[PDB]
Amino acid sequence: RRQLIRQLLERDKTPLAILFMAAVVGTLVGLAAVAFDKGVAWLQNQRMGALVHTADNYPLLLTVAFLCSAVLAMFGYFLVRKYAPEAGGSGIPEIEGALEDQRPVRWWRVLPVKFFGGLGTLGGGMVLGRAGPTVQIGGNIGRMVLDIFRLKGDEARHTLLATGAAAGLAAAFNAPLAGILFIIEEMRPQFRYTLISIKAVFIGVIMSTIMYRIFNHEVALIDVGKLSDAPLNTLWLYLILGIIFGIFGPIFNKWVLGMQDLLHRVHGGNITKWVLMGGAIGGLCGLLGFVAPATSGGGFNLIPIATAGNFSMGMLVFIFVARVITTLLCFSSGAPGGIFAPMLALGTVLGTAFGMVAVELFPQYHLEAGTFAIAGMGALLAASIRAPLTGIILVLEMTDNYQLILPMIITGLGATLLAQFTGGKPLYSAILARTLAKQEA
Template sequence: MPKFPDFHFHPGTQLRLRLSSNYFTTHPDYLVLLALSALVGAIAGLIVSMFEIAIHFMTDYRIHYFDELGLPAWITAILVIITGAVVAALGFWLTARIAPETAGSGIPHVEGALDGLHDIRWWRVLPVKFIAGVCTISSGMVLGREGPSVQIGGAVGRMCAEAAKRFQYAPHVLTASGAAAGLAAAFNAPLAGILFIVEEMRPQFRYNFTSFKCITLATLMATIVLRYFRGQEAVMDIPTFKVPPLASLWLFVVLGIVFGIVGIYFNRWILRATAAFKKYHHNRLLKVTLTGALFGGVFAFFQLYVPDISGGGIALITDFVREPMAWAILVLLFALRMLATISCFASGAPGGVFAPMLALGTLLGLAYGIVAAGLFPDLVAEPGIYAVAGMGALFAATVRAPVTGIVLVVEMTDNYQLILPLLATCLGATFIAQALGGSPLYSALLQQSLAAKAAEANAAATVDAEQSNAGEVPADVAADATAATAGGEDEKPATSA
């Protein structure tokens, strides 16, 4: 009787394995894995849909709750800012106290789980990522819900894998399927969800025909569930542009070079800022919570008075593409949002950077398009085309997944006819970023996290050894050393100051 498809890839045998009849088997085990993948996609799509609804509800409720009280405008504004600080502080506290692995986007955590370096405690990740993510994102911080959606989907996959413990590779396949489903549901982009796993997580994902079918089925189910709630329209309501002339493609290559350089520094600044924040608070609960309150209050203020510098940026993209401003103002907004994006994401808030990156790409691409339209009026059809190309270019330069960036942008904007300009821009950005020695963002964050954990474990072991030599080992030091070296826990919960 045919066995479950083999996931071991020995050198020189991949072609034989992919052509094996095992991949087309009707064995019950195989059908169980496909059924579980569909279930993972449906559950992930439902939770991600509720995640989006909850963020919009919390944002509107917090901003407009005090309007009916008849208070003076300045008092209402103060109350809105205070509530922003409180909900953000709650999100930071929940993350640090209960599930530290939910800090940030969570994508490096999923990649580590696929590589066997992390375990996904789904019973903590799911509620904490959902509630804390709603709190921090709705406070006005420059964060996206797409990265958290990937981690939520991965956690759903690991949860459903509990029903398939006897299948050795079920946790890996279902985690990858859930992550793909989460991204597909977040962006309403099923093809981008599939490609994100195959391209961006290629070092961790064990690709074969069976696992590919599983992630495809999961993204299909997640997208169906999402579209049941929000309809089948594209995420971004922007114009459909005409295909630019072939003679203008060199302008898109130049734009890709610009974004390749920008992407290198964007990644470096995020890594440095992340390390600086961790050095500042040392996982102390009070400092982490106060950091959240500060960020929540500041960006709640921006949300009221300078909305272009707050939020994930999806609404900003549609507004500016339809009604662009002067290129100098766009560059200024790009610089301000760059600083805000790096600060918010590096703070450890449970939120992603996908949507803020797309907003940054839009601003700089649109500014470039306005300048190019003035210099080469016969070549540039619409400055907005460069905004669309800029979204994919910054994604390609930072995440180092150009095909995913191209497909993601065309699915989100419904501008499938811009494939060729996007190819020129995204490949140019990727080539430059690689030539300058940059590392993919999420892989670099994973390596940074693992290095920090190893340093903490070594420091704890050194202290333990010194105390042992002295003949006295305090219980709290031994407990910290045990927690730092345990494989089942990803990070130690934050301690009080």
Template structure:
């Protein structure tokens, strides 16, 4: 009897190992997901440190040449202008799909509608993102990290020649790893793929495990390069009184309305930019140079309205602004976010959206405290809830928003008001007919691609008629 128990245990382990290794496809996918997580975390860490390094080099140049009577903001204009123009040029010239956050491109690739040219996108997104974000533009690094991670996933898929279904799983795993590393938030990275990419993600036990493993490994790598602290250092709030939950629901309703109009303004801004440059490279680069000049000056004169806004969140939540200042900053940062993200610069809108949510949430809390001083004692708690509220209304991924804020701020006791705020925001946005921003951006991208393809076909037909269609054109068409 004593011998039988160890034999059963040993046979069980042996059977597990045999099943694990005989299912070669599943086992390979699991190990590739671990590898992708390591690479995605490493790329995100390098991207993060690169942004800091580029920003410091820019400031060093500004202070070096601004030691005399020339104002620092005047020195910053040409430096930031050149940086942004370079970012716009390499994006338009080598990989136009690297513009913007890149998340719609990944969702399109998971549906088989968009190509993943990782050989071009990885270097262009990395360098373009460093220059655009380093110039002072109001962009986030999270979208680029997601696109970089997903392209790493496709790179590994191509190298190991995995099947179509497995390649999609590894693409999603890379995206999860990129977001998890960027925010130091593994749960949010996992949930973003499962919730936001639910219509594209091919659910199975193996693909889900791949996403989990990649997010965990990417976070570990990021923490090795940085630290294990939360991304944002804010006040740690205790459980709010239950009778204040109604205020959080009203805050969510407000974000539901704001989110709809914010998404509309993003699309309208992109259309305005497109009507200006019409796809012409040097017009596009000129816009980049102009924006670089503006944000170069703002980064010195008014840094609160430039950059991603992550550094602004603790100051807002800490009560450093009055109600008038919060409203003004919210409006100006909305404008600078639209100006930056709508241009097609290689940068994301995650962090700027979180900053805007914090600003409006704090404004709501300050006003609520003034009206109901006996009920509301900590207006900063509404700033934390606001981070998730605007994200839920615009991206339409409430669970991701809740987890993201909790992991970013380590405010685990704020989970109930976050749920109420994000639920209210999502309900109102859905009732009023709002649609997720990344879905709308993907549809716009596909529409523009179809229009460009039709125009190219028309141009070739006209060249054939006029006799300008050469042998070289025929060879290009076949390739």
């Protein structure tokens, strides 16, 4: 009790050095995040102009689509396998480990590798996101300034590393809240106390977000408009949807883990077969990125279309099935790029699909399938990555439909609950475990 009384009176006094440095960490991460985003776009853009150059000869056209993405993919697979192996996959499990002081933060290597390697895989039009990359980039940047300014202590090492990855997520989704929430729901040391200053994470998240706003304002990543409200006698439909996500979550989790194994056998661990396999996958995506764009790329483009109920039921099933395939191929291959974002598109489609059935089964509820897309958007997050509070707040920050806060919270919680009860695990924790154990195996 005596200690507590002392501690209470000393609560919320973060070292000003840690606060000021958090501001610079955020700023750099923001700018870096912007530069990454502009870069990816530029490359996808050039590929488009190349397809126009040869818009006539379909075979030739179907070739340079493959090659441009193949070459770009290989360049990314190489930069990872050669200079920074830790920069494979999302990057979140890695930074998560670094917070437990169980993985190293080699910023001198990861920063250029992830930035340029990711620039290739993403820009090639592979099914990967910016979230993971920017989060790892964010942490390394946070690590970088810690080193440069020689800030000593556990608090500083844990804080600056945290604000960086937070400000990294924020600047990748224009979601400041979701960024801060992700650090304290998933990223932080989950099994012990930590000296991460929340006030400091805030400051970093602000600056990076502000940086994003200077280069991206007036345009939202996802525009959905304002949808209809959700009656109380309609809420049970959302609990059901969450249950469906809840049982598919772990299954999808087994696949991404298992497909890592299968894809490993193809190259054995060899830098040549791996990069070659990489160009094969990347080439496939660039090909799909022309013959069926919905089956490739980030997937942010089909989200508003799905929510507006413009896809037919058949097209939705196609897109979902196809994108399960092309997501696993791209992420389980070890290519630099997160799976966080592509799960938004997966959830949105599964949600809309559910809404379509809900619309015709109960005309008395006067439903709109779009409300189920929004409920399902962060559901696969809630089910597979198991961070529902972050997913919900993220989806809210991106869709601005707060009147669906109850359906969203219900669907998400129904996802996590059923994921737990069917023996699934947090993917980022199940991956860090994979790596950490393999390290002492």
